[PDB]
């Protein structure tokens, strides 16, 4: 039959994270300044899900990038959700829309990294046991920084595990 879903937080956070994308759509996009043409990491039985969806400017997209870490990580114990908070770079006492860490990290890899329109993404380790498949929506919002604040997302919250149902 068809592989069933391996799931973890990731999928979580993205089911979140896209549907605050759509309602905050104005228009319906802009003109993406930047594209997804790469992606590199270890695959074993992956599933990628490549989509645009870019909108006026990175800070809305942190804002709620964050709102939705918030949300899905709260499904973890105390000392599991700071831990992982702090890898990534988001406090969890902040307002969501306060500047992470992480959204400075990313806006000033931004200033040095290579001008053009074609941006790499990594997304770590996209590994699934036989008769699963690791499910792993990536979104292009059309801005290097954010594309960089949702792969160290990714390359975070894609090793927590899941268990069904």
Do not use: W
Not at 33 to 61: D, W, Y
Not at 125 to 150: K, Y
């Amino acid at each position: 039959a068809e592989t069933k879903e391996f799931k973890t937080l990731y999928n979580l956070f993205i089911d979140s994270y896209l549907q605050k994308l759509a309602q905050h759509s104005i228009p319906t996009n802009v003109t993406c300044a930047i594209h997804i043409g790469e992606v590199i990491g270890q695959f074993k039985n992956c599933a990628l899900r490549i989509t645009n969806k870019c909108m006026s400017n990175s800070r809305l997209s942190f804002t709620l990038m964050v709102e939705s870490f918030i949300e899905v990580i709260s499904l973890l114990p105390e000392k599991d959700r700071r831990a992982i908070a702090e890898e990534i770079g988001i406090d969890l006492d902040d307002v969501p829309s306060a500047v992470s860490k992480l959204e400075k990290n990313c806006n000033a890899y931004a200033e040095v990294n290579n001008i053009i329109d074609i941006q790499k993404l990594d997304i770590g380790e996209c590994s699934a046991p036989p008769g699963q498949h690791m499910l792993l929506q990536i979104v292009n919002t059309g801005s290097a920084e954010a594309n960089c604040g949702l792969q160290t997302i990714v390359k975070s919250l894609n090793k927590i595990y899941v268990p069904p149902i």
